[PDB]
A paper describes a structure:
Red algae exhibit unique photosynthetic adaptations, characterized by photosystem I (PSI) supercomplexes containing light-harvesting complexes (LHCs), forming PSI-LHCI supercomplexes. Oxygenic photosynthesis in cyanobacteria, algae, and land plants harnesses solar energy, converting it into chemical energy with the concomitant production of molecular oxygen. This light-driven energy conversion is facilitated by two multisubunit membrane protein complexes, photosystem I (PSI) and PSII, which orchestrate light absorption, charge separation, and electron-transfer processes. Various light-harvesting antenna subunits bind to the PSI and PSII cores, optimize the capture of solar energy, and facilitate the transfer of excitation energy to the photosystems. LHCs specific to PSI (LHCIs) associate with eukaryotic PSI monomers to form the PSI-LHCI supercomplexes, whose structures have been elucidated in various eukaryotic species through cryo–electron microscopy (cryo-EM).
In this study, we solved a PSI-LHCI structure of G. sulphuraria NIES-3638 at a resolution of 2.19 Å by cryo-EM single-particle analysis. The structure reveals a monomeric PSI core bound with seven LHCI subunits. The PSI core comprises 13 subunits: PsaA, PsaB, PsaC, PsaD, PsaE, PsaF, PsaI, PsaJ, PsaK, PsaL, PsaM, PsaO, and Psa28. Encoded by the nuclear gene Psa28, the Psa28 subunit features two transmembrane helices that interact with PsaB. The seven LHCI subunits in the PSI-LHCI structure were identified as the products of seven genes: RedCAP, Lhcr6, Lhcr3, Lhcr5, Lhcr4, Lhcr1, and Lhcr2, at the sites of LHCI-1 to LHCI-7, respectively. The G. sulphuraria LHCI-1 was identified as RedCAP, a protein with unique structural features distinct from the LHC protein family. The characteristic structure of RedCAP is largely defined by a loop region inserted into a cavity formed by PsaB, PsaI, and PsaL at the lumenal side, as seen in the PSI-FCPI structure of the diatom Thalassiosira pseudonana. This distinctive loop, spanning residues Q103-T123, is also present in the GsPSI-LHCI structure. The PSI core of G. sulphuraria includes 99 Chls a, 22 β-carotenes (BCRs), 5 zeaxanthins (ZXTs), 3 [4Fe-4S] clusters, 2 unknown quinone molecules, and 6 lipid molecules, whereas the 7 LHCI subunits include 69 Chls a, 25 ZXTs, 4 β-cryptoxanthins (BCXs), 2 BCRs, and 5 lipid molecules. Most of the electron-transfer chain components of G. sulphuraria are identical to those of C. caldarium; however, the secondary electron acceptors could not be identified as phylloquinones, which are present in PSI of most photosynthetic organisms, including cyanobacteria, algae, and land plants. The A1 molecules of GsPSI-LHCI were provisionally modeled as ubiquinone-4 in PsaA (orange) and PsaB (green).
Numbering used by the authors:
A (entry chain J): 1 to 42
B (entry chain L): 3 to 141
C (entry chain C): 2 to 81
D (entry chain A): 14 to 752
E (entry chain O): 55 to 149
F (entry chain F): 29 to 189
G (entry chain D): 4 to 141
The structure:
Amino acid sequence: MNKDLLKYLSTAPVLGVIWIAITAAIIVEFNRLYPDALFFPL
Amino acid sequence: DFIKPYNDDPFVGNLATPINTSSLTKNLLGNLPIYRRRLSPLLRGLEIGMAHGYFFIGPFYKLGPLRNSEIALLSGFLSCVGLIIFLTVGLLLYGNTSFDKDESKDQLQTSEGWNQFTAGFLVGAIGGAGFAYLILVNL
Amino acid sequence: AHNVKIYDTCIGCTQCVRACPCDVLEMVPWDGCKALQIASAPRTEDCVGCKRCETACPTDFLSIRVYLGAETSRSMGLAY
Amino acid sequence: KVLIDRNVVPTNFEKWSKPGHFSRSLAKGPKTTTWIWNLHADAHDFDSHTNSLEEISRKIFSAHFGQLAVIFIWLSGMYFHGAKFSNYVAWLNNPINIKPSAQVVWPIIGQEILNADVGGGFQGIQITSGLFQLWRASGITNEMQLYVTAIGGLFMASLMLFAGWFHYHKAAPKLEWFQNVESMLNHHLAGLLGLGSLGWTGHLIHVSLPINKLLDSGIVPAQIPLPHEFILNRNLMSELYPSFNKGLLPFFTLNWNEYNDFLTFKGGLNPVTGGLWLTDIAHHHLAIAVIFIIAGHMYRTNWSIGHSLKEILDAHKGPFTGEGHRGLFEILTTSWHAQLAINLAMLGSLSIIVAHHMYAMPPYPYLATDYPTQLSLFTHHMWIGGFCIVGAGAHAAIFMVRDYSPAQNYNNLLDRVIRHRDAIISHLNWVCIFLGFHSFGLYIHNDTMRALGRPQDMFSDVAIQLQPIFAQWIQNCHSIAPGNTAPNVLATTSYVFGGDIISVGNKIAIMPMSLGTADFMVHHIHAFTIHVTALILLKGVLFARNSRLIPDKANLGFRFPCDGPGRGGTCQVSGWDHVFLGLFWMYNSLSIVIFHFSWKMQSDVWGTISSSGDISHITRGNFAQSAITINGWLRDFLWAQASQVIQSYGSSSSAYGLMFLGAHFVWAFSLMFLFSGRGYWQELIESIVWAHNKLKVAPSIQPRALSITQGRAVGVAHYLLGGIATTWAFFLARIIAIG
Amino acid sequence: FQISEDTPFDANPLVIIVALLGWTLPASIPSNIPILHGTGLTQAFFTSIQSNLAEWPKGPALDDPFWLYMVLWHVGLFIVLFFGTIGYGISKNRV
Amino acid sequence: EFNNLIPCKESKIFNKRLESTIKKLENKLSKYEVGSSSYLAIKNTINKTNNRFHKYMESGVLCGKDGLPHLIADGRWSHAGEFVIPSLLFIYISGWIGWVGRGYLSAIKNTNKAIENEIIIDVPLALKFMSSGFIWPLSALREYTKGDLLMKDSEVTISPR
Amino acid sequence: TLNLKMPSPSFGGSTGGWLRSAENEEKYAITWISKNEEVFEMPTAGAALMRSGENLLYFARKEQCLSLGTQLKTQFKIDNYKIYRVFPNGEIQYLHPKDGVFPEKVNEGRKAINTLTRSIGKNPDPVVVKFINKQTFE
Ligand code: CLA
Ligand code: CLA
Ligand code: CLA
Ligand SMILES: CC1=C(/C=C/C(C)=C/C=C/C(C)=C/C=C/C=C(C)/C=C/C=C(C)/C=C/C2=C(C)CCCC2(C)C)C(C)(C)CCC1
Ligand code: SF4
Ligand code: SF4
Ligand code: SF4
C-alpha cells in the first residue's frame, strides 16, 4: 500500500477519529447485545 | 466642489459643507441670542430663558400624571419651575468650575458674565413658562 | 509618565528601538556586549506604554521593561 | 477568450502528510500547540498563502466546485431519506392528518422512543424542512422518483468533484479569464437565472400544473398519470387546460391571451391547499425568465454592442462626491474580499426577504397549515441572513486592511467616506441612543406603570396609543389594490394585509394581521437592534486601517488582539474584534425578530375555526396586552411556551428537552472564554506541565493557552451555538405539540 | 445665496415652475381605473383637496383616497423636480 | 441496616413501575396492525423493558421508597458489583492507556522525529507499546522502585518563589 | 528652525484632523522633501498628494507624525523628514531625529538614560521599599 497514503492515515485527526469510532462501536455493540447493565452481575 | 476644507485648512478636523457653512446656516446661527452681536450676557440669558420656559410646559401639561385632572395646567407649571431650577443650578455649577480670574475678551466666558447669563435664564424661563400658562389657562 | 528601564542583559540588537512608535528609545555606545551598544530611554515623557518594545526583545527574561505609571494626555494617546 | 494553463499540479498524497505545506510560517512544523490551531485557522485564507492573484483565483474556483459537491451529497441524502425512510406516500394521500417524517432512529439504549407517532402507520422524527410540500408541488407521487433524483444527485456530486480536481490540477484558467466580468454577468443573468427560470416554467406547465390540479380535485395519487403521459398525450393536458388544444400557434402569433387558463394573475391562495396558485407561479417564472434573458444582453463581450461596466461607473459623478465611482471597477476586479463583502450582504439580505415572503404568500401546498414548517422556515432563513450580513462586515474590513490603496482611491466615493468617518459614526451613535431610549424605554415605562397599578398611564391600545398609522395605511392600499391600481389582479398578494380568513381542514392558513401599539413598539426594537449592529460593523470597516488612538492600525493587520495596555488600554480595536462584537448584536437582533414572529402568529393568526366561524387562536390574542411589558414576554412568552419543551421527558419530544438543556450548557460554557484571559490559563498550564515533567510524560509539542483571539472566537462560537440551539429546541417542541 | 463656505449657487425658481408644469400636464391625462374615476391624477388630487377643505377642521381619514393621490402626485412632482435640478445644474456647469 | 431500603423484588413501587410502563407501551401497540414493522418495534421495547425489570429483581439490588435501584458504595462485598468491581475494571483500563501513552512519548523523544511523531504517529511503534499494557501495574511498580518513574525536583523547571 | 510658511501636501480635508487641544496645548509638525509628486495615506485617513520639494503637515499627536515618517521611509524611501513640537505661545522644539541620526543607529555623543547595572531578576522585593519613595526598579 502506498507509503504517502499510509503516512496520511497516520496523522493525529485520522487516527483519532478511527480509534474513537472503533471504541464507540465496541461500547454500542456491548450495549446492543447485553443491555441495561447497571452493575456487574456476579 | 461643494465640500471644502474648513477655514481653508485641510488638516483641521472639520469640513465646510452646506449644513455648517451655507448662507442660510450662517444667517440663522449668527442671529441666535447666544451668538448675536452687541448683547449683554443678561439679555442673552433672558431671551434664551423665555424661549425654553415657554415650550417646557407642553409635555408636563399634556402627558404628566395629572393630565386628566382639573389642575393639569398648574401641575404642568410647577413641573416646569422644578425643571428650570435644576437647569439653573446646572448653570451655576458650570460657571463656578469653568471660570476663575481669567477675564477673557469674549465676556460670557467669565465668572461675572456667566452669572449674569444664569440670572437671565432663570427669570426668562419662569417668565416664559408663566406666559405659556396665561395663554393656555384662557385658551 | 511611564517608567522604562533597560537591564544589563541587553545584547544591543536594536529591535526595541525599531519597534517603538513614539521615539522613546535610542542606541548608545557600550562595552558590555558584542554589539558594543545598549538601548536607552531618554524620552519617556512620550511613552504611551504600548509595550511593543518588550514584544520585540529577544532576551530571556526581557532586557527592556515598561512599568505603567502616572497618566498624562500624551501617555493616554489623546488627540482631543 | 478562454485562457488556461495545462497539467499545473501533480496528483499524489505526498503533501497530505505534510500539514501546513500551504504556508511558509506553518510548513516548518509545530514547536507548540498554537501551531495546531493556526493550521486550521489559516487553511482557507488563500491570499495569506501567496501574493499571486492568479493562484488565489484558481484555488477559489476549485473550492467552489467542492462546495457544490457537498451540497449535492446533502440534497441527494434528503431525496434518499424521502424514498427509503419516510411516510411521504402516506402523507401524499392524506396531507391534513399525517405529520411528515423522513428520519428513523435505530433501537439502541432506549432511543427508539424518538420514533414518534406521525400517522400513516409510521414511526419517526417529525421533520420541519418542508420537503414533502416541495415534492408535492414538483409533482412527485412515488418513492421511485425520489430514488432516481437521489442517484442523479450522487452523479452531480461526482461531476462537481471531478470539475474541482480538473480545474485545479489539469486545466486551471488564467487570471484574464476570471476578470471577464462582463461575460460572467451576461451568462449568470441570461444563462443561469434566465434559462433556469425558463426551464422551471417548462417543468411547471408540463408536470406540476396537471398533477397538482388532479390531486386538488381529489384524484388518488396512484390513479394519476405519470409526468411523461401529459407530454406524449396532449389530450390529457387539454382536458385540464383547454388552451392546449390550440398548441404553440398562439405563442408565435402573439395571441398570448389564449393561454390565460394556465397563465393567470389570480393572487390570493388556492382554497384547497392554502398555497399560491401554480398557474400564477408558472406565469411568474415565465415573466422572470424573459426579463433575465434580456438583462443578460447588457454588457459588452466579444462584439461591438453592450456597455462597459467601467464606463458606466466612471460617468456617475456629481458636485457633492468628487471623482464619484472612479476606481471602483479596479477594486471589484482585483479584490475577492470586496466581491465577497457585496455578495454576502445581498445574499444575506435576500435570505431575510425570503423568510418574510414565504410565510405571507405560502408558495407550497399544505405549507401554511403545517405550523412547524412555517415557523422553521422563517427562523432558519432569518438566521442564515444574519450570519451573511455580519460576514459582509468582516470581508469589507479585510478589504480595507489588505487590498485598499490610496493611489487607487484619490477623491472617489471610498476616499470621501473615510474622510468623514467621525461624522458618520457620531450620528449613527446618536440615532442608536435615540432609538434605544424611545423603544426599550417604552417597555420599561410600561413595566413600571403596571407594577405600580397605573394601567391607564401605559403605552397600550387601551391607554396612551402608539398606532403604526403608516403601516396601517399601506395595509389598506394593498387590500383595495385588486381591480384598482392592479386592475387585472383578482385577489390580494397576501391576506396578511386584509381580506378573508383562509382555512384548510379547520386550521387557519393565513388571515389579516392587525397592527397596534404592541406592533409599533416591537418594530422600533428591530430598528434599534439593526442600527446598533450596523454601527459596530460600519465602525469596524471605517476604522480598520487607523484611528486617532492607533495611527498605524493597518500594519497590525485585520486580526490582532490589541496594541498593549498603553494609551489607556487598546483591547479589541482590530477589524476582527468588531466582527466578534457584531455577532452578539446580530444574535440579539434576530432573536427578537423570531420571537416577535412566533408570538404574533400564535396569538393573532394561527388556530382553529368552527363551522359557525369562531376563531380560536393558539394563545388567544394575548399579544396586544402582554407584549407591551418585559414581564409579559418573560411570563406569557418564555415561561408559558416553554411548558412543552420542559415537560418532554419520557415522550417522543424528549430529544428537544435534552437539546434544550444541552444548549443552555454550551451557552454558559462560552462565558468561561469570554470573561477570562489567557494569562490566567497559561499560568495554570505551567503547574500542570510541572506534574507531567515530574512523571516523565510531558509532550514535546509544548502546551499553550489559546491565543487571545482564539479565546474570543471560541467564546462567541459557543455563545451562538448554545443560544440558537436553545431557541431551536424551544420552538420545535412547542409548535409540534400545539401545531 | 451660497450653498457652502465660498460657493455661490444659482437656485433658479424657473426649475420649480418648469418641473411643476412638466409633471402636472401629463399627470392630468385621464384614466379608466376606479380610484381615479374618469379623470387623471392631477384632477383626482385637486378634487380631494377641495372635498377635504370643505370639512376644514376635520382631517382626511385613513381609507380616504386623498392620501394615495397626495403621495402619487408628489412622487411624480419630486422626480421631475429632481431631474430638473440636475439638468439645470449640468447647464450651469455644476458637475 | 439500610432499613430505609428494600430489595427491588420485594418492592411494590418497583413492581408498579413495571406495570405502568408496560400499560403505556400496550396502548401505543394498539394503534398499529399486527405484523407491521411499527408493531414489532413496540413489541421489542416491551420485551426489553420486561427483561430489564426482571434482571434487577433477581439481582438483589436495593430499592428506595421511590421504587428505584439505589447503589451501595461503602466497600461491603455484598454490593461489590455496584462499584468496587467496576472500579477495578476502570483502573486496569485507564492505567493501561496512560502507561502505554507514557511509554510511546518517551520512545520518540529518543529520536530526531520527537515532534513529528506526535502529530503523525509512528503506528508500528505505537502498537508495540499498546500491546505491552497488560502488566502495567507491575511495570509501573518496578519503574518506581528503580527510580525511573520520577524526575528529581531539581531537574524540573519552576518559577520564582 | 521649522519655517511656518513652508507649503503643504494637497488634501481636500477630513474630520480626522486636529481639534481644540492642538490650538491650546501642543501640536506636532512634520516636514520633508520629496523628489516628485506622489499620493500617500494620511494617518488621519484619506489620500493626499505630496508636493515635489518641501512638505509641511501638522498633527495632534507625535505618534501620527512618526507613523507618517515610517510610511515615508518604507514606501517612498524618504529619510529626510523632521518632527517638531509646536506650543501655542509660538515656541518650537525639534524632536526627531534628535541628533541628526536615527535612534536605531548607534551614535557617539549619546548617553545612557534609564539603564540599570543588573539583570531584571535582581530587583528588591516590594516589602523592602515599604514606607519610602523608592521603587523596586529604581
Ligand atoms: C424613554 C422613553 C420614555 C418616554 C417617551 C416616556 C414618557 C412618559 N413617561 Mg415614562 N418612564 C420611562 C421612560 C419613558 N417615559 C422610564 C425608563 C421610567 C423609569 C421606570 C419611566 C418612569 C415614569 C414615571 C414614574 C412617570 C413617567 C411618566 C411619563 C409621561 C410624562 C413624562 C414627562 O412629563 O416628561 C417631560 C418631557 C420633557 C420635559 C421633554 C421631552 C423631550 C422633548 C419633547 C424633545 C424634543 C426634541 C426636539 C424635537 C428637538 C427639535 C430641535 C429644533 C427643531 C429646535 C410620558 C408619557 C409620567 C406619567 O404620568 O405617565 C403617564 C410618570 O409619572 N415615566
Ligand atoms: C426619591 C425620591 C423621589 C420623589 C419624592 C419623587 C416624587 C415625584 N416624582 Mg419621581 N422620580 C424619581 C425620584 C423621586 N420622585 C427618580 C429617581 C426618577 C427617575 C427614575 C423619577 C422619575 C419620575 C418621572 C418620569 C416622573 C416622576 C414624577 C414624580 C411626582 C409624581 C407625583 C405627582 O403627581 O406630582 C406632580 C408634580 C408636581 C405637582 C410638580 C412638583 C415639582 C416640585 C415642586 C419641584 C421642586 C424642585 C426642587 C425643590 C428643586 C431643588 C432641588 C435641588 C436642585 C437642590 C412626584 C413629585 C412625575 C412628575 O409629575 O414629575 C414632574 C413624573 O412624570 N418621577
Ligand atoms: C499518555 C498521556 C497522558 C498521561 C499518562 C497523563 C497523566 C496525567 N495527567 Mg495529563 N493530559 C494529557 C495526556 C496524559 N496525561 C492530554 C493529551 C491533555 C490535554 C487534554 C492532558 C491534560 C491534563 C490536565 C488539565 C491535567 C492532567 C493531569 C494528569 C495527571 C493526573 C491524571 C489526570 O488528571 O488526567 C486528566 C487528563 C485528561 C482527562 C486528558 C485526557 C487524556 C487523554 C485521553 C490521553 C491521551 C492518550 C494518547 C493520545 C495516547 C496515545 C498513545 C499511543 C500513541 C501509544 C497525570 C500525571 C492533571 C494533573 O496535573 O494532576 C497532578 C491535570 O490537572 N492532564
Ligand atoms: C415646527 C417647525 C420648525 C421649528 C419650530 C420651532 C423650534 C419653534 C420654537 C418656538 C418657540 C420655542 C417659541 C417660544 C416663545 C416664547 C415667548 C413668546 C415668550 C414670552 C414671554 C413673555 C411675554 C414674558 C416674559 C416675562 C414675564 C411674564 C414677566 C417677568 C419675566 C419676563 C419679562 C421674562 C421650523 C422653523 C424648523 C420649520 C417649520 C416647522
Ligand atoms: S511602551 Fe511603547 S511607546 Fe513606550 S518605549 Fe515601549 S514601544 Fe516605545
Ligand atoms: S530589544 Fe532587548 S536586547 Fe535588543 S536592544 Fe532592545 S533591550 Fe537590548
Ligand atoms: S488585556 Fe489582553 S487584549 Fe487587553 S491590552 Fe492587555 S494583552 Fe491586550
